Amino acid sequence: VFRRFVEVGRVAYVSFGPHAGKLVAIVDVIDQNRALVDGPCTQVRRQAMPFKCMQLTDFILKFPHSAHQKYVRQAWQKADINTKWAATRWAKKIEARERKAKMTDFDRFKVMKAKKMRNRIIKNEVKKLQKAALLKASP
């Protein structure tokens, strides 16, 4: 059933806390509740971190457990996570959620205008498809 696992090299996304919104790599695990955590290319220095604020991604790096930050950074940079992360639907929903929050009053007005026209054109075509599909005369 399970597809994403806590393991050495597993890249996790920080949901809350001082490092919310960052990507980190799991270097080691301690006492079932915390893990040795290091994001050298995402500005998170090595430190303990509860598993509760983590959300596992699909990226797994290859380095030995408790390896130095240099080797984690080399593994992170080779097959770079930063560009791969930005291309996922997960990240671009985070980005879309961010730009919607920063939308100003003028942008809200222009979105209201664009949404109005888009919905009327779409909902026109829905009626046309409905009316077309209504012509069913067959035994």
Partner: protein
Amino acid sequence: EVQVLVLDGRGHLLGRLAAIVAKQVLLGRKVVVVRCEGINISGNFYRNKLKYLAFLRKRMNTNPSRGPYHFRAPSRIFWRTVRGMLPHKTKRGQAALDRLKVFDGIPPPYDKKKRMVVPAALKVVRLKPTRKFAYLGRLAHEVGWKYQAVTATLEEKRKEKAKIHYRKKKQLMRLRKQAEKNVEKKIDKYTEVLKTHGLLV
């Protein structure tokens, strides 16, 4: 809010849901709870049945017709639980209690309306998966409730009619997605505006 809050009672713990509903009605909000037979109580069933049987024992020795009134319907059981969390002997509390409407099953006014959920009172998040719980409908049935079978048949009828609505809703959505593909050239101008501002990823 000024509109009525319709809460689905299935999967919700009795006391946890009652605490939320009690503060809502004290804040002037109208709350409707449906499917009170689907409400859960933590602890194995036998234990929770003993608690109500102990409640049944509390009666005025001199005149039971005046004593505590033991309601056997799940909706009235939940209603009494909320009443224990309101100042029901003051005019403010009586006004709040009159803002609560409780139902077994989902009656015709609310069967066609969307029903809310309180995560802080849900069994799946509030209760460990290895713990035992009891269904309010079963507890009510075995302590005096008389309408478990008819409510089940009517709930099964309601579910069949809801499936038809969901298939029409899904068919409509499929047609809308096809429409978006059909009119894409005359829509990309407004699609781009939505995407720049976080709507329509």
